[PDB]
A paper describes a structure:
To elucidate the mechanism of protease-induced α2M activation, we crystallized and solved the X-ray structure of a porcine elastase-cleaved form of ECAM, a close homologue of SaA2M (81% amino-acid sequence identity) for which the structure of the unactivated form was recently solved. However, an alternative strategy of in situ proteolysis and crystallization with selenomethionine-labelled ECAM was successful. Most notably, in the structure of the protease-cleaved ECAM, interactions between the TED and the CTMG domain, which protects the thioester bond in unactivated SaA2M, are not present. Specifically, in the elastase-cleaved form of ECAM additional residues (Phe947–Asn963) of the BRD are observed that are disordered in the uncleaved SaA2M structure. The buried surface area between the CTMG domain and TED in SaA2M is 1972 Å2, with three hydrogen bonds between these domains, whereas the buried surface area between the elastase-cleaved BRD and the CTMG domain in ECAM is 1438 Å2, with five hydrogen bonds between the domains.
α-2-Macroglobulins (α2Ms) are found in eukaryotic blood, invertebrate haemolymph, the eggs of birds and reptiles, and the bacterial periplasm, where they are thought to play a role in the restriction of proteolytic cleavage. Escherichia coli α2M (ECAM) contains the conserved thioester bond that is characteristic of the α2Ms and which is essential for covalent binding to cleaving proteases. Pbp1C is predicted to be a bifunctional transpeptidase and transglycosylase owing to its homology to Pbp1A and Pbp1B, which are both essential for the synthesis of the peptidoglycan layer. Both ECAM and Pbp1C are periplasmic proteins that are anchored to the inner membrane and have been proposed to function together in defence and repair against proteases that damage the bacterial cell wall. The overall structure of α2Ms comprises a series of β-sheet sandwich macroglobulin (MG) domains forming a ‘keyring’ shape, a bait-region domain (BRD) spanning the body of the ring, a mostly helical thioester domain (TED) connected to the ‘keyring’ by a complement protein subcomponent (CUB) domain, and a C-terminal MG (CTMG) domain.
Residue numbers in the entry: 385 to 623, 636 to 742, 855 to 922, 943 to 1562, 1566 to 1653
The structure:
Amino acid sequence: SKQFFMFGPRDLYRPGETVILNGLLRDADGKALPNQPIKLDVIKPDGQVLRSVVSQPENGLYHFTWPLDSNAATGMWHIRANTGDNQYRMWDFHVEDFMPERMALNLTGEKTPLTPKDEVKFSVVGYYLYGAPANGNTLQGQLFLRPLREAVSALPGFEFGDIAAENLSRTLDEVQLTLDDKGRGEVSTESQWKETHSPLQVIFQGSLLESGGRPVTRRAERAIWPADALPGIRPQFASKQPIVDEGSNAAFDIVYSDAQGVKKAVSGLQVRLIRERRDYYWNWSEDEGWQSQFDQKDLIENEQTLDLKADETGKVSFPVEWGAYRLEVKAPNEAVSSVRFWAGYSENRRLDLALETPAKMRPNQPLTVKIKASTKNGEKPKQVNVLVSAVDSGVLNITDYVTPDPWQAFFGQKAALRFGGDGDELKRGGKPPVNHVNIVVQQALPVTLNEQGEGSVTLPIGDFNGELRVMAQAWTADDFGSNESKVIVAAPVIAELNMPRFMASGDTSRLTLDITNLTDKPQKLNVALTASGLLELVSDSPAAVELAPGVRTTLFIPVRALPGYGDGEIQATISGLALPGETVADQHKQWKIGVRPAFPAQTVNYGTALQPGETWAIPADGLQNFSPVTLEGQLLLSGKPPLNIARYIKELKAYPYGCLEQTASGLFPSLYTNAAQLQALGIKGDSDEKRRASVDIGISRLLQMQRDNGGFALWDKNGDEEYWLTAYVMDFLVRAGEQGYSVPTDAINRGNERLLRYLQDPGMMSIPYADNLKASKFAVQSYAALVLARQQKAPLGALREIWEHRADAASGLPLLQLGVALKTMGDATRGEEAIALALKTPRNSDERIWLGDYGSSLRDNALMLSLLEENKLLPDEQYTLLNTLSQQAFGERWLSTQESNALFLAARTIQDLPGKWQAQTSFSAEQLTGEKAQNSNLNSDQLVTLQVSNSGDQPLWLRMDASGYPQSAPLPANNVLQIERHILGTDGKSKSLDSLRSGDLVLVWLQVKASNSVPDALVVDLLPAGLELENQNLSASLEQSGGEVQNLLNQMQQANIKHIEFRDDRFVAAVAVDEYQPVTLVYLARAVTPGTYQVPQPMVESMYVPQWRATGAAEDLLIVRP
């Protein structure tokens, strides 16, 4: 069937850096195949496809590299491969803003389960990867105590421990340790879970802290039991908490087991079926927090006893009746295990490979590797190809990169639119500062070994301190194998600096300079320090130093971070160790950091449209407010539509039922479209047969609301006549037949002859609720005019008489109706006048005055437009009216079904019409053109002088958005939506920001709420350099079992969140936010660098309309001491 081994130097890249992917193709057997290509596709987190290739193989091997984009979205990416099979093999790989480790951490306890009173202790082993051990490096940690449910790891499905056991999950005392011992340190706890009859586990999450700096954090787990062996329960039912369907019986498998020791036996196991009545709940809103929930009582329903012999899988079954139960087996010894359920709601041909490699080496000189393959024979069958890569070991430990082993790869068995042009999610938050961390990765060419299975590569190594990992893979046509080797690289004396990931301009940190002697002879040096760029030394370093062999002591370097955006640098010139051996006298080192401002960027949004020959320039004072260094702009130049938010509304279906307006407004648009247009208009209403069939129904239904005199009532033919709707209804019924519907003849006639008497004798007409009868009656008369006029049944005489009562008119809509009525029956000169008047008559938009036309400024335009499309009239105004209608989009909070339709009927127009635009620009002196709509990115200098001029036959529409850091902290700006930031502790209680020592964890609470529905929201919490997010997307490093106050976690879980990114300087969340609905975001961070840091304001924006943003309230300064 074909098997494709995908493999690479690593699975953790970092936005910016090039990716390497390798491939080998074999069959079901694992033998070679005929030479062929393999389509590879690169896949972004969301699901889209960045790029794709047809990888040709050179010499049995597939290779694929491509440069991962600086602003690429952090997530998990995939490369997948079509093997013609139409099953895609995926190669997953991480992209995160990540920091290679520079240290290691082994933590162990023996794997034997303890007993209740047995204290718990763990091993610690702190060691820098250049060789040295953490001598005196402190260690933060947290000791948790969590229920251990799947204790028998050879019987997953069986659950162990009393599911209702009070207080089983606690977070025990915090860990704190100098580990002065060059080797190590140790961590114990005394038992406090005497009581339990349930199997528990103690969990240690430990962080080994670099010198005034980052953590390298790992967790160890140490099981705990209460008996020799424990009772187990597997509920037979599935699909989660498991439950019986109805009042059916509760099927269970039941057992008794040792640590893994299968099936030990005792009789007298007391099985019970406990039920839980839960009544009473809630608490006053504005309790702060809000509400609370139910209390319960537990009563027994069976006391059935079951016996069990060794190797026996018990089986109890019990009928139940619609409540929350739980099954609770009690062992003689006293270990209990409950489980809860609710009845309702709510072969060796591998090639032996060995690697000749130094155990240790200095940097800057090539690393030579030699490869010999035993082949499990005298000599290795055919040609030996070997590919060999080298990777900084601190990169592979975060992923825990198992080296790729081809052998067991072959033989190893048993989304429509957001609007975010790519990539803007960052851009709007503001250019991130540039992160200079350098990753060390080399891959060699594939080698063909000799006839003795021997060969050698030389991987040139640069300036580096730490462990390397050499890895190699080998293949013949039929045989495969691999191996890895750990090659330390150090200097005679290491000096590596410690910095935060960035610094906000104004921030001040105290960088630590690690410096270790690996020479054996004591040495005396002078570390002369310079700082240039947007970074300056505040004070004066210790001049000279002195060290024994194998000892490091650090220097502290305090640093004012200068205003602006760019890069700062620290130069060390290190004098000493002038050598007749190493051939050296001095050594110069450089280190660089990114400086950005301390507040989030802003954006500005212009949109207009230009009929040919018009020119759009940009305001002079419009960008006046931004820092130009970091300002960029988009300029989408669509030639087909306006705002065109055909969506932002829907689904749309046929509702034949209800009163007369429900019914009419229910069907009125279903006349004019079908599934086709709909599943292509990005919305789907009704099966095409269900729509027609459902119109047919509402027709015959309306007819029965037709009174004798031919006009209509709301519910029955005996109803009080409703005047304006009688017109409306007819309009529908007339239109109906033109769209292939059957309307009875006279029914329509009885109605028309009535509509006439709407023109001739308004005296009869009495409108029930509405005032301004003058205007209400006029509006009625003109709708009735149109309708009859379409039929050629609107007598030119009566159209005049109403043409002079025109001063009564409230809206322009009637006039436009009456213009077209006139136009069509003769007398175009009144028509043209009545029309041309209509267009310059607006409605007062307070509209509580209630005229009985169900209208508004909003729809009467949408209809005045939907009219002109029909008659092909005054197309110049058509754009004008359309553009004014576009702008009813800001005012799209709660539209009626009449405004919806009347819009949708104007909107369905846009779909077909092209398209074609042409325009001159300030930039690209060439004529820009396009079939569709095209974006164009602009820098500061381009856009400050930006002008755009149409050049074509059609009008175009241009949107621009421009984003960059301002000169000065935006004052807190609530608009549409808004945002609070609260720094909670680890114990869930607001933390004094001045109270922070390094290594401390902190919980950040973002409450985001809105007055609209804003589905393209963008949360962007910038950071104070003091903090660094503890990334979860990864993790071998740190978790939200750590987070105690679930109040909020639970909430977060509900919210519709497209993605959360954890990035060097920014918390970023794309999300949908609503009214009546807050959106709780919580994210875990740590304080690393000591100093005093400016806290940005938290912000959020709507992607589509940037004017919808909320700069939240600025917090005070963050101070970190140690």
